[PDB]
Amino acid sequence: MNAPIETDVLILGGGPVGMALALDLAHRQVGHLVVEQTDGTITHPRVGTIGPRSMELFRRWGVAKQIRTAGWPGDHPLDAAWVTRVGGHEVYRIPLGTADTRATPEHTPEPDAICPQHWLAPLLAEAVGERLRTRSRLDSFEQRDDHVRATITDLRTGATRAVHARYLVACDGASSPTRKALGIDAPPRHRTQVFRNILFRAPELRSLLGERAALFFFLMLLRFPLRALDGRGLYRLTVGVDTMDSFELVRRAVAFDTEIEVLSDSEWHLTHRVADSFSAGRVFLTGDAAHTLSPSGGFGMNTGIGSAADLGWKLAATLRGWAGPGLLATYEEERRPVAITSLEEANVNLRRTMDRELPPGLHDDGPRGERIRAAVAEKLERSGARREFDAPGIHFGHTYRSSIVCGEWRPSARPGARAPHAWLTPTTSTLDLFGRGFVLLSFGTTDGVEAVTRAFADRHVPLETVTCHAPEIHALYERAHVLVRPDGHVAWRGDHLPAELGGLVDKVRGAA
Ligand SMILES: Cc1cc2nc3c(=O)[nH]c(=O)nc-3n(C[C@H](O)[C@H](O)[C@H](O)COP(=O)(O)OP(=O)(O)OC[C@H]3O[C@@H](n4cnc5c(N)ncnc54)[C@H](O)[C@@H]3O)c2cc1C
Ligand SMILES: O=C1NCc2c1c1c3ccccc3[nH]c1c1[nH]c3ccccc3c21
Ligand SMILES: [Cl-]
């Protein structure tokens, strides 16, 4: 006869986002538990590209190294190429080097990475440990005044147990049963696109392609993308449906006569949706459950991870007791607008490919087809197609303009924006200073800092003060004092600390 289990945060869903939230909560020493209905095994990778901002967060949570050393070949091309057929005529290619050779980015200590879900999942599961309960399905929940009660069914054995948690964070996906149960709607913002995904293994295809290999192959037969999943034989063909045999589809897209074994052929319905509300009482929505966006630019999962990181610190602060009563509401305040708009940027990338048409003689071998291909190439570059593969602003430019920020692409320390990266040492970035409590960076004068420290202490708001004597970084941040939030974003800056510190403290913690 087992009794109710107690934990501060119960995370519903062990997908990438739910795991990201668990990592942040562990990093902040908040008791939590993750319940995942499946056994946690991946049979058909849905994600693989990890944006630089997400990698910075994985760096913070201590798993960035293993993600990078998970198995993506250091010498595999990262290029994006528009081709009339893989192995056939090439139309346009965006060179992106290789993991081992590309220049270290100047704006971030962590460039993007490739980690197919079948590697990421075990890796995330390993980092979350025993707090991840697989084959566990949350059947129902009931909110009470100071906690939420959930009934969990052990799908391995068959026994049902109850979990009493202070907060339930639903990371249960795009069709979020939890969102429905809360009576919150997520009205479509664009027509539902139905995609057919064919996961196949072609052991010798990379050898046949060689340097002509690519991470992304945008075919133009009739038009769709083919991806190198693990850079080791596993590929994924994505074709829009709006019906040939799975094997015959791949065969048509690949001009080579090589071993091709289709492993999976499932369907995917993408419906750009954003919840009208990101929470009800003590129940929260994160990831696709809160906002489903288009995968263009890997924008979807990266936004979920960023939203998970935002809710993580606001939850910790409230559980700790130093947060104002209105801090948790700022999760929706700051993250929904990121979805409401940012879901549009992904859509633009989808539209550009959905609208591109193909002319006659594009497959020809004569100098004519080579000329018409060069024609489409020019158009492609003009339509800004290389923007879906290079948009730092999209990964790092989101600036919060909220009730807890004191308002006043290139890295900027303006209030609301991500505090910029700069190397302290060859291994330590300004980013490595953020992630715990608030951080006050002072460039030069330390006059007035003791006042800030006391103001934060009077409210029990964690604050770490750092004096920096580096002009290059001071120039970068543009002000003498910069107050950074637990999430790495600037809450306030200025050459002179404000007069009413109590006001500042109550505002940034969501008490004002
Ligand atoms: C068939 C399919 C194909 C896709 N293809 C692509 C693609 O090609 N590119 C792309 O960018 N994105 C793709 N996606 C979307 C991508 O997987 C998500 O955007 C991403 O992983 C976001 O993660 P999430 O963590 O919010 O939720 P999800 O990854 O959707 O995970 C939700 C988790 O909740 C668990 N869960 C649900 N209900 C319960 C319960 N009652 N109790 C316990 N656990 C529960 C699930 O088992 C699951 O593991 C696809 C999705 C599907 C369904
Ligand atoms: O993961 C994906 N799954 C589908 C996808 C993905 C990605 C994707 C993933 C990471 C980075 C850029 C990306 N662009 C696209 C994409 N551009 C497209 C155009 C038409 C139809 C589908 C896509 C597409
Ligand atoms: Cl509480």
The answer to the question of whether 285 is labelled as a binding residue is: no
Tokens representing 431? Answer: 């980013």
Alpha carbons 485 and 328: distance in angstroms, whole number: 15
CA of 149 to the centre of ligand 1 (A): 24
**What are the residue ranges of CATH 3.40.30.120 in the chain?**
397-512
For the chain, residues classed under CATH 3.30.9.10 are 73-109+185-277
CA of 217 to the centre of ligand 2 (A): 10
Alpha carbon 258 to its chain's center: 35
CATH 3.50.50.60 boundaries in the chain: 1-72+110-184+278-396
Nearest alpha-carbon partner for 57 in 363, 342, 370, 432 = 432
* CB 435 near ligand 2, within 6 Å: no
Please choose, from the candidates 269, 268, 299, 309, the residue with its C-alpha nearest in 3D space to the C-alpha of residue 18: 309
Specify burial of residue 269 (Cβ count, 10 A radius: 0-12, 13-18, 19+).
exposed
Q: Whose CA is nearest to atom 2 of ligand 1?
A: 268
Q: How far apart are CA 219 and CA 235, in angstroms?
A: 14
Ligand 1 atom 22: the closest Cα is on which residue?
A: 301
Binding residue per annotation — 476? no
Distance separating alpha carbons of residues 105 and 47, to the nearest angstrom: 23
1-72+110-184+278-396 CATH pick, 3.50.50.60, 3.30.300.30, 1.10.300.10, 3.30.1490.20: 3.50.50.60
Between CA 179 and CA 182 the distance in angstroms is 5
Residue 433 gets which letter from DSSP? Answer: G
Q: Is the CB of 298 under 6 A from ligand 2?
A: yes
CA distance 63 to 70: 11
Position of tokens 């910069």?
482
DSSP state of 287: G
Q: What is the resolution of this structure in A?
A: 2.1
Could you please report the per-residue DSSP string of 323-352? S-TTTTHHHHHHHHHHHHHHHHHHHHHHHH
Q: Which atom of ligand 1 is nearest to the CA of 171?
A: 26
**Cross-strand partners of 80:** 94, 216
Expressed in angstroms and rounded, the spacing between residue 19 Cα and the centre of ligand 3 is: 22
Does residue 18's CB lie within 6 angstroms of at least one atom of ligand 1?
yes
Q: By the 8 A CB rule, do 236 and 45 touch? A: yes
Distance CA 422, CA 241 (A): 46
Query: Which sign does the torsion angle of CA 496, 401, 434, 394 carry?
Result: negative
For the CA of 288, the closest atom of ligand 1 is 26
Ligand 1 proximity of 15 Cβ (cutoff 6 Å): yes
Query: Atom 29 in ligand 1: which residue has the minimum CA distance?
Result: 15
Q: Is 288 annotated as a binding residue?
A: yes
Phi, psi for 98 (deg, rounded to 5) = -135, 165
Q: What secondary structure does DSSP assign to 199-267, as a single string? A: EEE-TTHHHHHGGG--SEEEEE--EEEEEESSSSSEEEEEEE-----HHHHHHHHB-S----EEEEEEE
User: Can you tell me the distance from the alpha carbon of 174 to that of 269, in angstroms, rounded to the nearest whole number?
Assistant: 10
Q: 179 CA to middle of ligand 1, Å? A: 14
Please list the helix, strand and coil fractions of the chain in percent, rounded to the nearest 5, in that order. Answer: 35, 25, 40
- For ligand 2, whether the C-beta of 350 sits within 6 Å is yes
Beta bridge partners of 152: 138, 161
Secondary structure element (H or E) that encloses residue 99, with its range: none
Q: Which of 26, 32, 28 is nearest to 10 (CA)?
A: 32
Annotated binding-site residue? 49? yes
Are 250 and 137 within 8 A, CB to CB? no
**With contact defined as beta carbons under 8 Å apart, do 64 and 109 qualify?**
no
Q: How far apart are CA 453 and CA 455, in angstroms?
A: 6
The answer to whether 478 is annotated as binding is: no
| Cβ–Cβ < 8 Å for 253, 88 | no
What tokens does 192 get? 């539902």
Closest listed ligand to the CA of 315: 3
- Determine the Cα–Cα distance for residues 386 and 65; give it in Å rounded to an integer: 28
Which residues, other chains included, contact 397 with Cβ-Cβ below 8 Å and sequence gap of 6+? 409, 417
CATH for the 397-512 domain, from 3.40.309.10, 3.40.109.10, 3.40.30.120, 3.40.50.300: 3.40.30.120
Could you write out the three-class secondary structure of 126-175? HHHHHHEECCEEEEEEEECCCCEEEEEEECCCCCEEEEEEEEEEECCCCC
Q: Does ligand 2 have an atom closer than 6 angstroms to the CB of 296?
A: yes
Half-sphere exposure of 50 (CA within 13 A, CB side): 27
Compute, in angstroms, the gap from residue 401 CA to the centroid of ligand 3: 26
Other Cβ atoms less than 10 A from the Cβ of 510: the count is 22
Architecture of domain 73-109+185-277: 2-Layer Sandwich (3.30)
Rounded to 10°, the helix 52-60/299-320 angle is 30
Burial 115-152 (b: 16+ CB within 10 A, else e): bbbbbbbebbbebbeeebbbebebeebeeeeebbbbeb
> Whole-angstrom Cα distance, residue 248 to residue 433?
53
Report the 3 state secondary structure along 451-482.
HHHHHHHCCCCCEEEEEECCHHHHHHHCCCEE
Rounded to whole angstroms, the Cα distance separating 460 from 280 reads 27
What is the distance in A from the centroid of ligand 3 to the CA of 318?
6
Is the CB of 14 inside a 6 Å radius of any atom of ligand 1?
Answer: yes
Question: Which experimental approach was used here?
Answer: X-ray
- Are the CB atoms for 63 and 127 separated by under 8 Å? yes
317-348 burial, b at 16+ Cβ within 10 Å, e below that, comes to bbbeebbbeebbbbbbbbbbebbeebbebbbe
- Per the document, the length of the chain is 512
CA–centroid distance, residue 196 to ligand 2 (Å): 13
